[PDB]
A paper describes a structure:
First, DegP is an allosteric protease, whose activity is carefully regulated, and a hyperactive DegP variant kills bacteria. Second, because DegP is an inherently promiscuous protease that degrades misfolded proteins, over-activated DegP may destroy various proteins that mediate essential processes in the bacterial envelope, such as cell wall maintenance, membrane construction, or cell division. Previous report showed that substrate binding accompanies several allosteric behaviors of DegP: proteolytic activation, assembly of cage-like proteolytic chamber and positively cooperative binding of a substrate. DegP mainly degrades misfolded proteins, but its over-activation by the tripodal compounds triggers excessive degradation of newly synthesized proteins and leads to bacterial death.
Interestingly, activation was observed with TMB_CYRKL and TMB_CKYRKL, but not with TMB_CRKL or TMB_CKL. In particular, TMB_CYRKL increased the cleavage rate by at least ten times more than Lpp+Leu and TMB_CKYRKL. The concentration-dependent activation and inhibition suggest that the tripodal compounds also bind to the active site of DegP. Alanine substitution of each residue of the pentapeptide (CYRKL) revealed that tyrosine is most important for activation. Aside from the allosteric activation, we also analyzed the effects of the two compounds on assembly of cages and cooperative binding of a substrate, and found that both TMB_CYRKL and TMB_CYYKI assemble DegP cages, but that they differently affect the binding of model substrates. Overall DegP structures were almost identical to that of the dodecameric DegP with an active conformation (rmsd 0.697 Å and 0.986 Å, respectively, for 2309 Cα atoms in six DegP subunits). Additional electron density maps were found at positions where two degrons of 18–58 are present in the dodecamer model. Because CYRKL and CYYKI have hydrophobic C-terminal residues that can occupy both the S1 pocket of the active site and the hydrophobic pocket of PDZ1, we believe that these peptides are located in the two substrate-binding sites in the same fashion as two degrons of 18–58. Taken together, the crystal structures suggest that the tripodal compounds mainly bind to the substrate-binding sites of DegP.
Residue numbers in the entry:
A (entry chain O), E (entry chain R), I (entry chain P): 471 to 475
B (entry chain D): 11 to 35, 82 to 357, 362 to 448
C (entry chain E): 11 to 35, 82 to 359, 364 to 448
D (entry chain F): 11 to 32, 82 to 357, 368 to 448
F (entry chain J), G (entry chain K), H (entry chain L): 460 to 464
The structure:
């Protein structure tokens, strides 16, 4: 999925 | 003359404790184990899922002494908590070790309290490193060990052959609920960091970089003509962020962190989310073939699901010069949807309470009223709206 | 040229056997394992519960040599059997070790016939010492091991790295009928003490201290201002007792046994519950924190399956001077309910043979005629009972 | 200073992989590289059978693609070959026969797909079998943790040398209970190398029939050993017969190595290739008989009948047909002489080959059953 | 409960 | 099917 | 559950 | 009592 | 039960 960092 | 672990466990085992915890909600008792970090202060690290929703918490040392101990901090996004002892007198602390030196092959000795039998020791090896994804949400950089671990081992210590703490055991993988050769442990360097945030702040200062990404497979490196197969592909570089300030390129792959290679994104993602808001770390890159290493710093991130308490439906903040709470959120079908909270409408507040900011609301909402009725006004229409 | 258990297991593995019993309650057959104690006599030790209800017992050697074996006795209170090999030739006996030298963290190697496969070896470590409290009736002082142990490892061997017997593998804690890393084994000194009586007498002389007591927890330690958090608390001392003679008063906390620290009351119970009558021993105890030592010996305890070899419902009490086969305990619905007689009264007159002593029974009770005729004197009257 | 396996594993993890296979199912598993240049990976047949596509993923991330090379469901070894292989690492073989119970073992695989996982243990026992009756098994047993997906993995000794391939475990709950089995290296060596030279496992058998030797038979027939291999009947005209093994014999050693059970020897030699020579240790009348043997199978011929030439250019002769064979179903009998086939006058088996090598859907044979002239039809 | 040695 | 303990 | 074996 | 892997 | 080998 979309991944945030 | 034999080899033995007894000389090491003879001096470390007093630094592992049993944990019996009582909640009030539905009320339950739960079992577990912990690790004494600080002797004088009495800081005992444990798992978050072990200690949440708990009225009474009693700690039982390796000795047999029963203590009392209330919470010092928690963090369910990585499953680490901290507690400290009532009347801490003559304790023993564990020695931390650098989890970043561990290799797939080192021998591990686990400690904990399975099935409330008491302090049991197990031997094994580091099965593999940087394990993530068994629960996609939380920060996972699990050390995998074949050392035996069962129910109640959580918060238990995983220590190398010198007795230095390399991990806190947090999970297993058991289709029947019994150890089948897979244990999972959170590295001590992530643990030392969150035990270090719960002492000074009381909570965790959720750090923020300013990038986005996704796990670099072996397919992307084939077409992107990238040399490495495992890394972190920076899709989105967020603007005005401390990350972008370092010149982080769009389309890079982070492969280094303190000169130490990186297993996975969800590991690097996990490795960073366990840090204080004002730390400084280096990243090795790979833009077009040049491994440009750049220093960096993290920048800030006030959650409103803690004001909901079961009726969470959408995101509410603060407006202007405290003209009111905020309703930019537009959610349909949520717990806060049947009660018709649509967009562009905050007011004063409930039960004759002047509410113009998020804090002024929290002053009186948490007086626990039987029924609470907002005052929200859409356009010119002053309406009301009731809960509980 | 790497480290290995193979050179030690070359010599010790023959001393481990597999047993296969057939019997009645039915029809059933089950399997276990055994350890050769006396080579020249044919003395195999095993678990009592693999030996209950035994018509024919056939050991099998490691090399495939099959044999036959009659019982030498049993001990249902510690789950230790012992058996005698019929026509034994060229056996090997395993060396013992002193269980009082075991420390947590030492290395262990488990040998047995798990799952009817064959002589299977597993390794582990001493997970913990002196675990008990799985069934109140039995004297247990178990050793916890992570060495894999499964069904059929019964009465197996557990040994240190010099091939010296430390334990007889007894039970596993495993919710789902398969080892999850917890194994329990009776220590060597216990097995050594019990078997020793089982050779001379075919029974265990139970010698008592004459003390009542209970587990000392850290909350009772707060009560009595005692600086010990585990130990043995003294409820009351019986009169004309070996302990009462020694100077044991109510309100003392037993802290040591022959200088060795005490893990629990359950261990103190199980440890001296096995020693033969008149065994010298030292105890350390705590009366108002003045650490007092005392010595004593055990005295006699005073106040069916021992002979039947199949039905443990009744309980053959003491013969008496003239009397015999008196009984003092029976359960309703036992195999001692099909027989006709009851606990309240019993004597002897079997098959028109003037008989009174339990030894005079078996000289005809082993004759096994087609039909048996008891002759108790229930009440003041004469009666008879028939069988087979 | 603490000892560790990380030095040994650093050199060996490159040689294990994870494999993925894809009404239609999708499979997990593990394999191990045998030949770096050609990219040969070995694994268990029960992960790579019924495989539309075979996707190998090395230790470093690099996914590749593989095709089948051989298979052998009877022992459960199957071999793949990696397509377009660059920079591969071959694991070093070990001689399983040097294993002893009590040795230390390391199990590398891909359990539950999680990733390349390492687990330690000891040699629980050797020569185990009897779990799959109709199967060749000489299993190594290890208490090294092994679960679903670890199959086809690596069992290496403390020096990283391949001693066996992890295969099956006994576990009522579906999780390892401390009883894990593995196929010995030496068997894998024999099965793999056969798949490269011949594509299949050609495993002819010497001709002993017989059954296990139990301690009860030791008494009845004055036999010094309690575990071995008892010979019922020898097949006639087989190597077992030619070598002079008789009924009532007991087999105690294979090539100087002792035997555990008849079911093990049945597996050790089931993996040997056709024509392998060997020496058995027998026991007749309590005296040591040492034998030497050579395995045997289970143009100039045809499916059912044996054809040789006769006379100059006259035609080939069917010299014997076994009843029930295909060539006896088509009607060919003893003595028939083939002068033409499909309007093509035939002489030698070479003019018959090219005609037959056309692989036509029909065969009209202009034979000569005795003095008469007939046609025979096949296919 | 209460046990007697 | 991952259990946490 | 405890298992005797 | 029969399993495979 | 006799098995060929």
């Amino acid at each position: 999925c979309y991944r945030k960092l | 003359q034999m080899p033995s672990l007894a000389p090491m466990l003879e001096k470390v085992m007093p630094s592992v404790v049993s944990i019996n915890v009582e909640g009030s909600t539905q009320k339950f008792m739960a079992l577990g184990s912990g690790v004494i970090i600080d002797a004088d202060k009495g800081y005992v690290v444990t798992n978050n899922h072990v200690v949440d929703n708990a009225t009474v918490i009693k700690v039982q040392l390796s000795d047999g002494r029963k203590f009392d101990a209330k919470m010092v901090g928690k963090d369910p996004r990585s499953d680490i908590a901290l507690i400290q002892i009532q009347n801490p007198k003559n304790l023993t602390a564990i020695k931390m070790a650098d989890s970043d030196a561990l290799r797939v092959g080192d021998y591990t000795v686990a400690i904990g309290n399975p099935f409330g039998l008491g302090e049991t020791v197990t031997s094994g090896i580091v099965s593999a490193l940087g394990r993530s994804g068994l629960n996609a949400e939380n920060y996972e950089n699990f050390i995998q060990t074949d050392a035996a671990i069962n129910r109640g081992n959580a918060g238990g210590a995983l220590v190398n052959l010198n007795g230095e703490l390399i991990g806190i055991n947090t999970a297993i993988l058991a289709p029947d609920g019994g150890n089948i050769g897979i244990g999972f442990a959170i590295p001590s360097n992530m643990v030392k960091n969150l035990t270090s945030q719960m002492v000074e702040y009381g909570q965790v200062k959720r750090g923020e970089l300013g990038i986005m990404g996704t796990e670099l497979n072996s397919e992307l490196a084939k077409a992107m003509k990238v040399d490495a197969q495992r890394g972190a592909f920076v899709s989105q570089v967020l603007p005005n962020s401390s990350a972008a300030k370092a010149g982080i390129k769009a389309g890079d792959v982070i492969t280094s962190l303190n000169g130490k290679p990186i297993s996975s994104f969800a590991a690097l993602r996990a490795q960073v989310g366990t840090m204080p808001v004002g730390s400084k770390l280096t990243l090795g890159l790979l833009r077009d073939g040049k491994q440009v290493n750049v220093n960096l710093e993290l920048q800030q991130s006030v959650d409103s699901s803690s004001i909901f308490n079961g009726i969470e439906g959408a995101e509410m903040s603060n407006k202007g010069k405290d003209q009111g709470v905020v309703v930019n959120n537009v959610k349909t079908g949520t717990p806060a949807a049947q009660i018709g909270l649509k967009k562009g409408d905050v007011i004063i507040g409930a039960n004759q309470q002047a509410v113009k900011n998020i804090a002024e609301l929290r002053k009186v909402l948490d007086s626990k009223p039987s029924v609470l009725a907002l005052n929200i006004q859409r356009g010119d229409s002053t309406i009301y709206l009731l809960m509980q």
